[PDB]
Every structure is written in C-alpha cells, then in structure tokens.
Design a protein around this ligand. Sequence first.
Ligand SMILES: *[C@@H]1O[C@H](CO)[C@@H](O[C@@H]2O[C@H](CO)[C@@H](O[C@@H]3O[C@H](CO)[C@@H](O)[C@H](O)[C@@H]3O)[C@H](O)[C@H]2NC(C)=O)[C@H](O)[C@H]1NC(C)=O
Ligand SMILES: *[C@@H]1O[C@H](CO)[C@@H](O[C@@H]2O[C@H](CO)[C@@H](O)[C@H](O)[C@H]2NC(C)=O)[C@H](O)[C@H]1NC(C)=O
Ligand SMILES: *[C@@H]1O[C@H](CO)[C@@H](O[C@@H]2O[C@H](CO)[C@@H](O)[C@H](O)[C@H]2NC(C)=O)[C@H](O)[C@H]1NC(C)=O
Ligand SMILES: *[C@@H]1O[C@H](CO)[C@@H](O[C@@H]2O[C@H](CO)[C@@H](O)[C@H](O)[C@H]2NC(C)=O)[C@H](O)[C@H]1NC(C)=O
Ligand SMILES: *[C@@H]1O[C@H](CO)[C@@H](O[C@@H]2O[C@H](CO)[C@@H](O)[C@H](O)[C@H]2NC(C)=O)[C@H](O)[C@H]1NC(C)=O
Ligand SMILES: *[C@@H]1O[C@H](CO)[C@@H](O[C@@H]2O[C@H](CO)[C@@H](O)[C@H](O)[C@H]2NC(C)=O)[C@H](O)[C@H]1NC(C)=O
Ligand SMILES: *[C@@H]1O[C@H](CO)[C@@H](O[C@@H]2O[C@H](CO)[C@@H](O)[C@H](O)[C@H]2NC(C)=O)[C@H](O)[C@H]1NC(C)=O
Ligand SMILES: *[C@@H]1O[C@H](CO)[C@@H](O[C@@H]2O[C@H](CO)[C@@H](O)[C@H](O)[C@H]2NC(C)=O)[C@H](O)[C@H]1NC(C)=O
Ligand SMILES: *[C@@H]1O[C@H](CO)[C@@H](O[C@@H]2O[C@H](CO)[C@@H](O)[C@H](O)[C@H]2NC(C)=O)[C@H](O)[C@H]1NC(C)=O
Ligand code: NAG
Ligand code: NAG
Ligand code: NAG
Ligand code: NAG
Ligand code: NAG
Ligand code: NAG
Ligand code: NAG
Ligand code: NAG
Ligand code: NAG
Ligand code: NAG
Ligand code: NAG
Ligand code: NAG
Ligand code: NAG
Ligand code: NAG
Ligand code: NAG
Ligand code: NAG
Lengths: 453, 48, 48, 40, 127, 126, 121
Amino acid sequence: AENLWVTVYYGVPVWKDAETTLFCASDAKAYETEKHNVWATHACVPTDPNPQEIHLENVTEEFNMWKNNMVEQMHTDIISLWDQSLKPCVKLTPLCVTLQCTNVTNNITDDMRGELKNCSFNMTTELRDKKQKVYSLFYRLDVVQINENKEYRLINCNTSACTQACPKVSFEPIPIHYCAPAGFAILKCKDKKFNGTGPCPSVSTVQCTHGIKPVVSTQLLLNGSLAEEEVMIRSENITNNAKNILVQFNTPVQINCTRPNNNTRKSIRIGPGQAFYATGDIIGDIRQAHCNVSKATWNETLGKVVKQLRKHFGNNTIIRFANSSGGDLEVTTHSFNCGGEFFYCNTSGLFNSTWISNNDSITLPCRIKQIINMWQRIGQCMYAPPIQGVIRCVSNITGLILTRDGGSTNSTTETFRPGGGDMRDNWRSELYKYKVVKIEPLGVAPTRCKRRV
Amino acid sequence: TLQCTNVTNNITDDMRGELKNCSFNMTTELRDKKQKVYSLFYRLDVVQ
Amino acid sequence: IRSENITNNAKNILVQFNTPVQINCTRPNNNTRKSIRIGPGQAFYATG
Amino acid sequence: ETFRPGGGDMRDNWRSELYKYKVVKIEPLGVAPTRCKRRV
Amino acid sequence: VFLGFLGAAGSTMGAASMTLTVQARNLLSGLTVWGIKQLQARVLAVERYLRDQQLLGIWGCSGKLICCTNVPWNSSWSNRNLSEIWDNMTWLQWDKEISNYTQIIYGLLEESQNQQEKNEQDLLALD
Amino acid sequence: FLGFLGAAGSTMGAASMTLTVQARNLLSGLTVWGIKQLQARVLAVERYLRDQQLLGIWGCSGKLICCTNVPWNSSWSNRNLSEIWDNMTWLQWDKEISNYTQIIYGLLEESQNQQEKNEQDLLALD
Amino acid sequence: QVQLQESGGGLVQPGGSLRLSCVASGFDLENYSIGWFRQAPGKAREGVACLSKNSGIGHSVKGRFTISRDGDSNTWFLQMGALEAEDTAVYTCATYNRACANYVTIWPEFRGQGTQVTVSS
Ligand SMILES: *[C@@H]1O[C@H](CO)[C@@H](O[C@@H]2O[C@H](CO)[C@@H](O[C@@H]3O[C@H](CO)[C@@H](O)[C@H](O)[C@@H]3O)[C@H](O)[C@H]2NC(C)=O)[C@H](O)[C@H]1NC(C)=O
Ligand SMILES: *[C@@H]1O[C@H](CO)[C@@H](O[C@@H]2O[C@H](CO)[C@@H](O)[C@H](O)[C@H]2NC(C)=O)[C@H](O)[C@H]1NC(C)=O
Ligand SMILES: *[C@@H]1O[C@H](CO)[C@@H](O[C@@H]2O[C@H](CO)[C@@H](O)[C@H](O)[C@H]2NC(C)=O)[C@H](O)[C@H]1NC(C)=O
Ligand SMILES: *[C@@H]1O[C@H](CO)[C@@H](O[C@@H]2O[C@H](CO)[C@@H](O)[C@H](O)[C@H]2NC(C)=O)[C@H](O)[C@H]1NC(C)=O
Ligand SMILES: *[C@@H]1O[C@H](CO)[C@@H](O[C@@H]2O[C@H](CO)[C@@H](O)[C@H](O)[C@H]2NC(C)=O)[C@H](O)[C@H]1NC(C)=O
Ligand SMILES: *[C@@H]1O[C@H](CO)[C@@H](O[C@@H]2O[C@H](CO)[C@@H](O)[C@H](O)[C@H]2NC(C)=O)[C@H](O)[C@H]1NC(C)=O
Ligand SMILES: *[C@@H]1O[C@H](CO)[C@@H](O[C@@H]2O[C@H](CO)[C@@H](O)[C@H](O)[C@H]2NC(C)=O)[C@H](O)[C@H]1NC(C)=O
Ligand SMILES: *[C@@H]1O[C@H](CO)[C@@H](O[C@@H]2O[C@H](CO)[C@@H](O)[C@H](O)[C@H]2NC(C)=O)[C@H](O)[C@H]1NC(C)=O
Ligand SMILES: *[C@@H]1O[C@H](CO)[C@@H](O[C@@H]2O[C@H](CO)[C@@H](O)[C@H](O)[C@H]2NC(C)=O)[C@H](O)[C@H]1NC(C)=O
Ligand SMILES: *[C@@H]1O[C@H](CO)[C@@H](O)[C@H](O)[C@H]1NC(C)=O
Ligand SMILES: *[C@@H]1O[C@H](CO)[C@@H](O)[C@H](O)[C@H]1NC(C)=O
Ligand SMILES: *[C@@H]1O[C@H](CO)[C@@H](O)[C@H](O)[C@H]1NC(C)=O
Ligand SMILES: *[C@@H]1O[C@H](CO)[C@@H](O)[C@H](O)[C@H]1NC(C)=O
Ligand SMILES: *[C@@H]1O[C@H](CO)[C@@H](O)[C@H](O)[C@H]1NC(C)=O
Ligand SMILES: *[C@@H]1O[C@H](CO)[C@@H](O)[C@H](O)[C@H]1NC(C)=O
Ligand SMILES: *[C@@H]1O[C@H](CO)[C@@H](O)[C@H](O)[C@H]1NC(C)=O
Ligand SMILES: *[C@@H]1O[C@H](CO)[C@@H](O)[C@H](O)[C@H]1NC(C)=O
Ligand SMILES: *[C@@H]1O[C@H](CO)[C@@H](O)[C@H](O)[C@H]1NC(C)=O
Ligand SMILES: *[C@@H]1O[C@H](CO)[C@@H](O)[C@H](O)[C@H]1NC(C)=O
Ligand SMILES: *[C@@H]1O[C@H](CO)[C@@H](O)[C@H](O)[C@H]1NC(C)=O
Ligand SMILES: *[C@@H]1O[C@H](CO)[C@@H](O)[C@H](O)[C@H]1NC(C)=O
Ligand SMILES: *[C@@H]1O[C@H](CO)[C@@H](O)[C@H](O)[C@H]1NC(C)=O
Ligand SMILES: *[C@@H]1O[C@H](CO)[C@@H](O)[C@H](O)[C@H]1NC(C)=O
Ligand SMILES: *[C@@H]1O[C@H](CO)[C@@H](O)[C@H](O)[C@H]1NC(C)=O
Ligand SMILES: *[C@@H]1O[C@H](CO)[C@@H](O)[C@H](O)[C@H]1NC(C)=O
C-alpha cells in the first residue's frame, strides 16, 4: 500500500497511428477458368472464407479522410499493375507512315457526318524486304492533318510510341481486399452519420477491407458503394472554391447504353510473330453510341441532393447547376469504360436546372477514342484493339464530384459545375471509413509488489 | 556516312583542323521521310 | 608518401600534399545546342 | 632516379580516401574461469 | 468469451490484465507487385518482435506477461490514488498520461537488474 | 558515461560492468541500396538468434553473467587468479584461448542435460 | 509564399501585340497550373488561358491568345496579337486546378494583383 513499485506488463491494448504496406486478398472463384486480368490476382493470396470483425466499445478514435495514406498506397499499385501487364505484347512503332485517308459515305446519318475515315497506308510484311498496301477505319479523334486525299498522321508519332494492348487480357474489374500484416490492425468506423474529419465513437476492428472494385471514371462515379439514410456531402473544407464536394447517393440511378454498330476486326502482320488488329468493314447502318438514363429518377435525386446541400449555404439561396465550362478532354466529359471500348459521352442534359427555395428518358451522345492515355502521364499510350459485335453496359450512378464557382462577394446565386482532376477521388470514396494502427504492447504500471529475492 | 569538311570561321592557328563541319541524312519522326542535317564534330570523334 | 612495397618499379607511389595547389580552367567559346528529331519522342542535341 | 606520372586501374582515387579505416565484426560471447558453483 | 484481437481495448485496467495472451499470441503471425512488398514487412515484423523481446529480457524479466521489478514510484510522475489508476481509466488514457516519462524508467530498470546480478554473483562466491 | 566498445581497452575486472551497452544494439534497426541492404537485415537477426540459442541449450537464458558447472581444466591455462582478472584485456584473453573454445561447448551441453534429467526424475518421483 | 508576380503592362495601339508574363515560386508550383484573368469595368470575370499540366495543352478561349512556357523556368508567357477595342481590361494571373478544371467561370485562390492594359489610338 504505502510502497508503490513499477511493473512491466506485456501485451496491453495500446495503439498508435503509423503507416505500412498492405497486401492482396481476392476471392478465389476457382480462377482456373480465367481469361487473365490486368489487375492480376494470381499473385494475390487466397482470402479468408469468412472475415471476422470484433466490436469494440467505450472507445472514441478520431478519423481523417483527406490525410489518409491508404489512398496514396493504392494509387501506386494500380499504376504498377498496369505497367506490368502491358510489357509482354506487341510494341508497334511502324504505324505512323503518312496515312492517305479519305471520307466514308456508306449509309451514314447526319449526326455522324465526318468522324470515321478511310485510311490507307503501307506496311512492312514479315520479310524485311517487301511492302504491302493495307487499309483501315480510323476515328476523327485519332488522326490529325499534316502539310496544310490529304495526308494525315496518327496523333501520337509526334511525342511518344505506344504498345497495342495484349489482346488476350480483359479490363474487367474484380473485387480486391487490402489486408494489413501482422503487428497492425485495421480500425473501421461504423457510424452512419460520418462526415469526414470527425471522431467515430463506434469504431470496431476488422481483419481487412471489404471488396472494392478498382473502377475508373470521371465526374460520375460508377458501381460504387452507397450509404444509409440520406445522401451525404463530404469536403475537405467547404468554404473554398478549389475543393471538391464528394456527394454520395442513397438510391442508385441506372444508366445504360450500347454501341449500335457492327464491327469486324481484321488481323494483319507487321513482322515476325507480331500482329496488328485493325478495324474494317462496318456491316450495317452507322449510328452514334448514346447512353440512356431515366428522367423520373434524376428529377428526384437532384432534388434530394439539393435539399441536403442547402444546409451549409443558408436556407434562402437559389442553387443552380451547370455543365462543365472547359478544360481537358478527360475532365469535361464522362469517361467511363465498357467492355474494352472507351466512351467519352457528353453530359450536358443532366446539369441543367435552377432550384428555388419556395415514359421519357434522357439520352447523352458519346464519342469513341482508341488512342487512350489514362493514368495521365507524358510518354505513353495504348492502342485499344477493336472488338466485334455490339456491346451493352448497365451501370450504377452512385456519386457525383460537383465543384463550386462562388467568388462573387456575398449573394445568392450559388452555381455548381461537375469537375474532376486528379484520379484520387474515385478511391477516397471507398476507403474513407478505415485507418491502420500499430499496436505497442509493452507498458508500465505501479502496484504493490517487491520481487522478493 | 558523314560528309565532313573543315572549319574556317575566324580560326586560330593553335586550333587548326580539330573542329569539322559534318552533314548527314537522318530519319525524321515519320518512318518515311529523311532530313538533311549538319553538326560540328571534333577531330577526336570521327575517323577517315 | 605511401606505397605497396617501395623498392619496386611496378608499384604506384601515392603522394598526399599538405597545402592545395589551385588550378583554373575554362573553355573560351559559346556552343549553342540545337535539337533535332530522331523518331517518336527521342531527340538528339547536336552542336550547331 | 627518374619519376614519371602514370595511372592504370581506376582504384587509386579511392585508396586515398578510405585508407585509415577498417571494418570489424564484434563477437560477444566469452568464457572465463571464476569462483562459483551453480547450486541446485 | 470476450476474445478477439484488441477485445478489451475499452475495458478498464482491472479486467484488461486477463487477456494479455490474446494480444501477444499473434505478434508474429505467418519481382512483381505482391512480391517484394510482402517480404518488406515479413522482416520488419520479426525485427520488431525480437527487439521487444530483447528489451524485456535485459531487465529482470522474461518470465513473460506480468513481471515484478524494483525502482519504486518517484511519486511525481502521477499524483493519483491506486484505486484511481486501476479501476477507472483505460490503457490508452494511461499511455497518454505517461507517454513522456518513460525514457528514464527504461534505464532505471536495467541498472537495477545489473545491480541485482552483481549482488547475486558476489554473494555466490563466499559460500 | 562510456559508449559502444568504450571499455575494450579497460581491464578485465572493470569490463564486466558495461555488458548491457555492447549487447543492447546487436539488433539495431530493385536498385542499388535495395536487395544488397536487405541481405544484412536478415544476416544480423540470424546471427543474433544463433547466439541466443547457444546461450540457451547450455542453460542460462538470463543473459549477462551466468556461471555454471564443468570445472576448469588446468591444461587449458596454468595461470593465477588475480593474474587473469586485473592485468589483462579481453582481446588478449581471446588470443590466449582461441583454439580451445571447441570442447567446452560440448561439455556444457551434456552437463546441462545431466542436471535437467536429475531435476526431472527427482521431481517426478515425489 | 505562392503568390504570383506579374509584369508587362502598357498601352497598345489597336492592331498590335503584347508579351504579358508573370513569375512566381513557393515550393508548390508542381501541383498547380497557372492561367490568366480578364476583368473589364461593368462586366463579370472571364478567362483567357490555362496551361494544363499532365497534358501540355494550351487551351484558350479566343484564337489569338496563346499560353506558353519554356524549360523549368518558373515564368509563364501569355502571347496576344491583333488586339481590338474590346481588349481593355485588368489582366491577372492565378493558379487553377491540376488539369485546368472549370475556368472562364471559377474564382481561384493564390491569385495575383494584376497589371493594366488599355487600347486606344
Ligand atoms: C458495373 O457492373 C456491371 C455488372 O457487372 C457491369 O456490367 C457487366 O459488364 C460486363 C463486361 O461488358 C458484362 O460481361 C459480358 O457479358 C456478356 C453476356 O454474358 C458476355 O458475352 C461478355 O463476354 C462479357 O462477359 C456483363 O454481362 C455486364 N453485366 C450485366 C448484368 O450485363 C459494368 O460493366 C460495370 N461498370 C463498369 C464501368 O465496368
Ligand atoms: C474504304 O476504302 C477501301 C479501300 O480504299 C474500299 O475498298 C474498296 O471497295 C471497292 C468496292 O466498294 C473495291 O472495288 C475496291 O477494290 C476496294 N479497295 C481495295 C483496296 O480492295 C472501301 O469500299 C471503302 N469504304 C469502306 C466503308 O470501307
Ligand atoms: C477553409 O477555407 C476558408 C476559405 O475562405 C479559409 O478561410 C481563409 O483562411 C485564410 C488563412 O487563414 C485567410 O487568409 C482568409 O482570409 C480566410 N477567408 C475568409 C473568407 O475568412 C479557412 O481558414 C479554411 N479552413 C481551414 C480549417 O483551414
Ligand atoms: C436499361 O436497360 C434495362 C434492361 O434492358 C431497361 O429496363 C427495361 O425497360 C423496359 C422498357 O420498355 C421495360 O419494359 C422492362 O421491364 C425493363 N426491365 C426490367 C428488368 O424492369 C431500361 O429501360 C434501360 N434504361 C433506360 C433508361 O431505358
Ligand atoms: C455547356 O453548355 C453550353 C450551352 O448549353 C455549350 O455552349 C455551346 O457550345 C457550342 C460548342 O462550341 C457552341 O457552338 C455554342 O454556340 C455554345 N452555346 C452558347 C449559348 O454559348 C457548351 O459547349 C457546353 N460545354 C460542354 C463542355 O459541353
Ligand atoms: C454536348 O451537348 C450539348 C447539348 O446539346 C451540345 O450543345 C449543342 O450543340 C449543338 C451542335 O451544333 C448546337 O447546335 C446547339 O446550339 C448546342 N446547344 C444546345 C442547347 O443545343 C454540344 O454541342 C455537345 N458537344 C460538346 C462538345 O459540347
Ligand atoms: C557548316 O555548314 C553549314 C551548312 O552547310 C554552313 O552554313 C552555310 O553558310 C553559308 C554562308 O557562310 C550560307 O550561304 C549557307 O546557306 C549555310 N548553309 C545552310 C544549310 O544554311 C557553315 O558555313 C559551315 N561552317 C560552319 C563553321 O558552320
Ligand atoms: C618488395 O619488392 C622486392 C623487389 O625488389 C622484393 O624482393 C624480391 O623478392 C623476390 C621473391 O622473394 C626475389 O626473387 C627477388 O630477388 C627480390 N629482389 C631483390 C632485389 O632482392 C621484396 O620481396 C618485396 N617485399 C615483399 C614484402 O614482398
Ligand atoms: C591563363 O593565363 C593566361 C596568361 O596569364 C591568360 O591569358 C591572358 O588572358 C587575358 C584575358 O583575355 C589577356 O588580356 C592576356 O593578354 C592573356 N595573356 C597571355 C595570352 O599571355 C588566360 O586568360 C588565363 N586563363 C584563365 C585564367 O582561365
Ligand atoms: C470529308 O470530311 C471532312 C471532315 O473534316 C469535311 O470537311 C469534308 O467536307 C468532307 N468531304 C466530303 C467530300 O465528304
Ligand atoms: C505505298 O507504296 C507504293 C509503292 O509503289 C507507293 O506508290 C504509294 O504511294 C505508297 N502509299 C502511300 C505513300 O500512301
Ligand atoms: C507535337 O507535340 C508538340 C509537343 O511536344 C506540340 O506542341 C505540337 O503541337 C504537336 N504537333 C505537331 C508539332 O505537329
Ligand atoms: C464534420 O463535423 C465536425 C463536427 O464538429 C465539424 O467540426 C467538421 O467541420 C465537419 N466537417 C465537414 C463538414 O467537412
Ligand atoms: C435510348 O432511348 C431512345 C429513346 O428513348 C431509344 O431510341 C434508344 O433505343 C435507347 N437506347 C438504349 C440503349 O436503351
Ligand atoms: C452483326 O454481324 C454478325 C455477323 O455478320 C451478325 O450475326 C449479326 O446479326 C449482326 N448484327 C446486326 C445487328 O445485324
Ligand atoms: C423535376 O424538375 C422540375 C424542374 O426544375 C422541378 O420543378 C420538379 O420539382 C422536379 N421534380 C421533383 C420531384 O422535384
Ligand atoms: C437546358 O437545356 C434546354 C435544352 O436542352 C434549354 O432549353 C434550357 O434553357 C437549358 N437550361 C437552362 C437553365 O438554360
Ligand atoms: C445497382 O443498384 C441496384 C439497386 O440497388 C442493385 O440491385 C444492383 O446490383 C446495382 N448494380 C451493380 C452492383 O452492379
Ligand atoms: C582540311 O583539314 C585537313 C586536316 O588534316 C587538312 O589535311 C586539309 O588540308 C584541309 N583542307 C582544307 C581545304 O582546308
Ligand atoms: C542524303 O540523301 C540524298 C537523297 O536525295 C542524297 O542525294 C545525298 O547524297 C545523301 N547525303 C549523304 C549520303 O551524305
Ligand atoms: C610503414 O611503416 C612501417 C614501420 O615499421 C614499415 O615497416 C613499413 O615498411 C612502412 N610501409 C611503407 C613505407 O610502405
Ligand atoms: C556567347 O554566346 C552567347 C549566346 O547568345 C552570347 O549571349 C554571349 O554573349 C557570347 N559570348 C560570351 C562571352 O558568352
Ligand atoms: C463500457 O462502458 C460501460 C459504461 O461504464 C461499462 O459498464 C463497461 O464495463 C465498459 N466495457 C464494456 C466491455 O462494455
Ligand atoms: C509531457 O508532455 C509534454 C511533451 O514533451 C511536456 O512538455 C510535458 O512537460 C510532459 N508532461 C509533464 C506532466 O511534464
Ligand atoms: C588504460 O591504461 C592505463 C595505464 O595502465 C590505465 O590507467 C587505464 O585505466 C586504462 N584504461 C583506460 C580506459 O584508460
């Protein structure tokens, strides 16, 4: 009692905040009958058949969404898994001879006037001696005029050269789990009214994350994870005009679309072993790909979003939406992916309204590009090979990345326009209720012991 | 095969010879056309 | 004066000084580098 | 006696800065006699 | 029972000193991506565990979980009642309170252990 | 106070006080500076584990001074007592006994085994 | 810090050209892209140029105005030609989003003070 003596305790529940490297855990799904994936999960280990979560209590731990290292750890794994899966296949440099292109007039519609082009050029055959005359169909977004049947040129044999995508693999996303190594724990906040930089007095611990799809989109999140109750508004600091507003939906909105044009890929040879799959002969009419959304759902989802959003900007304000006002070609237009073909739809029929304080469907035209430059860098691209038949995609609009304009002193004319930028807000919307903690077990405490000799 | 000639632009007897004009054909960014460029090459980097 | 075995004719004799001996030099010219195109992306910078 | 400058292997520019150094592996275990006996 | 990793992290210190085994049993569980990434952590974890074990062994300890020791409380680190410490706070609060008095303690413990070793060694001589 | 290897010039008698200093840091802490560095962080832990296992099997595990059976044989070194512990350094001791440190490592193991069997049978009998 | 320092203002005879430029530092001009303002009395704010990072593209709202850069030097040159009577305003250079997100409408942070450009015979 009157004597107080130190005592060393091992393995007490004490943790600190730190950073480390997490690893794969993907569902097996047999995986023997697989057509490979660019996000190769064969290197990843099999996952737990049933993850177990332990509910904590009495503990309130502060979180943070905008200063999380998990996001920056993920963005250097998708890129690294992308560069690794484009190395062992064709590396076509000899495709930028002076193309001699002309127009196409095979039963076209005035909406798709121009666009497709009949290009014709010379290639080196498998023998290093002879040359062959080939022809192809090239979209207007992949050829530029030179020397102003005028000669054209691929937009890319001016700054870089690109490797045609490996034709066996597919761009299908698959769920992936991120699990921490031994000696660390994954804290997860289970409160339904989380708002970003705020403590969760319900935090539990989990073996590791739930399956999260590495989808890629812009200004409209697709196939995301919804939220309970009502739509949620998150931001870094919502008083500024240079910070995004990551809206999260409650009731999903279905969007679906196709490419109504038959396409027959044809293969030609450019060397020993290597092949080049170019498009030729569109069998049928010529129409433009367009995406349909249901008006009866958007007409109420925008209303719910504005009702929730009017909290931070006063009650007597006129919220007004608008379309993107300019920028790059990846930010100002929807840029999703659908079965190996990259659409660039033009969303200006949605962000069109004005809201005061007191069956029909919407169609969005689209364009197709083949010389993609995702993971924005300088010195790479990827010729996406043409695919046969007509593809259809049905997708789930659970999100929005609106940004403000403001700046015009104090008034009530708040306008919101969609906007992207860094492709890091598509993963800060799925890894927001997680943090990684390092356990420090050794501890010291006073008690009534002596350690008699 | 470089085609090279001498340099006689305000030369100094200590640096006689040495530098050489050298013209040659180079492939442009397109795999079809050829340029015609020139450069100045020291006498220690070219052989007859 | 350091050496591996200083009585031989095939072993270096490393000498370490006491006071530095300053040495200057410069190249009394202006070369201007021009850039020409080799192919897709690559460039070659050649004196001009 | 005539002296002439001369190089050779590109290894005498680093034998002039790493000359008063060496690396040693420390072996801790030791044995010595003293006046005990482990009492059971 | 109330098992699981970090299960009693919210429980009081009185009942927290019963699951020390659970929180210490799994401290050592076990050229493309998912390659050297795993191997960069599977060595760090081993090094951390070995360092903790060596630190525990330097003092008069390594029985394991609970270990008595000399060097009494300085009475200035915490002017709190014993029942105050052991029945109302949690381990996280205790760490926050004594996060920054430990450095001298980590040397006091080892010097006490060395003194005890010398006492035993020179006592085992005259007999 | 002193530091790492600070008593390596001190006498044997005063050297057996800083054993903790020279024992606490045996576990300190692609491209070049990649796998080459990673080799050392594995070799060090392997050496430390081997040393601990040796300080194990003999019967000790308390580290530092741990004095034992297997009485000294005069054939190894016919010297006095104060001659060893007050006018020598550990390096000189290693030089004197370097070839004889191979039979002791075998005697200690069997002594420990005998002690363990004696204790076990004595305990299990009653 | 990041604040932008501008220079090159003056008076122009209709049918001429300018070399407006602005230079800044602050250990953070790697995440941002620098564009330009345009404010005439009685009118709102517009945009004139935005040199987007990640693409090197030289977006502009009118054909005459072009933005440009040179090497690693932290200076940006706005080249304008064939000015008319309507190009009399206050020109400011500010920092926009990393991919030149919405301009000609946004009001950015880390903005400059602004030179003066007047046109008349
Ligand atoms: C969001 O999730 C939906 C649901 O999985 C994705 O739609 C799916 O897209 C794939 C790829 O085009 C479709 O697979 C294809 O199925 C056809 C018919 O079986 C088959 O012939 C093809 O070889 C290919 O396997 C899948 O059917 C389709 N799901 C449904 C219900 O139609 C969608 O792609 C996801 N969003 C994004 C942006 O990827
Ligand atoms: C695009 O161009 C190709 C070749 O320039 C056209 O193919 C020609 O089709 C006619 C009949 O319509 C044949 O008589 C020619 O022999 C074909 N050319 C060659 C080189 O074989 C093609 O019709 C054009 N249009 C489309 C839609 O492909
Ligand atoms: C959120 O953003 C607002 C932007 O208005 C920040 O307020 C500005 O803060 C800077 C630096 O303190 C001042 O120079 C400005 O005058 C402030 N603006 C206004 C209108 O007051 C605010 O500080 C940000 N919040 C946080 C936590 O950083
Ligand atoms: C998205 O595709 C789905 C399925 O093709 C469409 O849903 C069907 O729409 C028709 C309209 O005539 C209904 O008769 C069907 O009952 C619907 N299917 C189901 C399962 O209910 C949907 O219309 C498409 N999206 C839009 C905006 O039209
Ligand atoms: C956003 O919407 C506006 C108007 O709805 C678009 O402005 C038109 O753009 C076209 C394309 O150059 C012009 O031909 C029209 O004259 C413009 N109309 C007006 C009234 O200015 C604008 O292009 C849309 N932005 C995007 C990115 O789609
Ligand atoms: C994106 O969609 C908008 C919405 O229709 C397009 O804006 C119209 O474009 C046509 C094309 O000539 C013009 O005639 C109209 O005046 C435009 N405005 C309206 C209200 O219809 C726009 O052109 C599309 N494309 C781009 C690149 O913005
Ligand atoms: C190196 O070669 C160039 C080109 O062959 C020479 O430049 C020529 O200079 C004369 C006058 O001195 C001009 O009339 C020619 O038009 C130039 N050629 C070209 C292609 O423009 C140059 O004189 C030579 N010598 C040096 C030292 O540069
Ligand atoms: C240093 O170099 C001298 C060379 O002059 C070595 O002396 C020679 O040793 C070889 C082998 O023992 C004899 O065959 C020569 O006859 C010796 N030369 C003379 C002049 O006597 C000397 O051994 C070298 N030092 C060491 C330590 O090896
Ligand atoms: C090396 O020393 C020589 C001689 O001292 C320098 O040559 C002089 O250069 C100056 C500057 O052009 C002339 O005014 C003198 O007439 C030169 N003297 C001569 C040629 O005897 C030379 O500049 C020095 N080089 C350095 C310092 O880099
Ligand atoms: C061919 O298409 C181009 C599109 O750039 C158009 O300008 C041109 O008028 C068209 N010519 C014919 C003959 O269709
Ligand atoms: C392809 O090569 C032939 C060789 O006879 C040539 O006549 C033709 O113009 C070439 N086509 C081009 C350069 O588009
Ligand atoms: C080629 O790329 C450069 C950028 O390096 C660009 O400025 C130019 O417009 C492109 N097209 C040409 C030179 O025809
Ligand atoms: C989240 O809620 C907390 C509650 O105090 C508030 O301080 C913080 O600013 C909020 N963050 C937002 C609205 O982004
Ligand atoms: C989209 O809707 C239009 C008219 O509402 C219809 O003609 C078209 O076939 C639809 N497309 C898809 C893919 O649903
Ligand atoms: C597209 O072409 C294939 C093969 O010629 C054919 O089976 C299919 O019916 C075509 N699609 C349409 C919509 O005509
Ligand atoms: C649909 O949009 C109109 C136009 O702004 C609006 O008046 C109406 O309230 C919307 N529908 C709902 C259910 O809010
Ligand atoms: C929305 O677009 C329609 C035509 O698509 C147009 O009549 C209307 O004016 C637009 N909304 C606003 C606020 O201008
Ligand atoms: C889209 O949302 C609907 C409604 O909740 C859901 O049934 C469907 O599975 C979602 N699509 C996905 C997850 O691909
Ligand atoms: C050119 O330089 C070479 C260098 O040896 C020399 O032999 C030759 O005479 C020179 N000729 C002229 C015309 O300068
Ligand atoms: C470069 O090519 C042209 C082709 O017309 C040729 O006449 C000339 O001799 C070449 N230059 C050389 C080989 O130095
Ligand atoms: C260095 O000095 C020692 C002193 O005994 C001498 O034996 C040795 O030969 C010397 N080494 C040289 C001069 O290289
Ligand atoms: C050499 O060339 C540069 C390039 O224009 C020029 O500015 C400079 O004045 C010239 N002379 C010297 C001594 O640098
Ligand atoms: C949590 O807090 C309550 C309220 O004081 C307490 O009764 C309980 O023992 C604490 N621990 C657990 C595990 O519930
Ligand atoms: C521990 O907290 C701060 C951090 O160094 C220190 O200033 C303070 O003095 C320490 N606590 C006490 C009670 O002295
Ligand atoms: C070194 O030798 C001297 C002379 O015998 C002795 O006094 C001293 O204690 C020794 N040790 C140290 C650390 O100086």
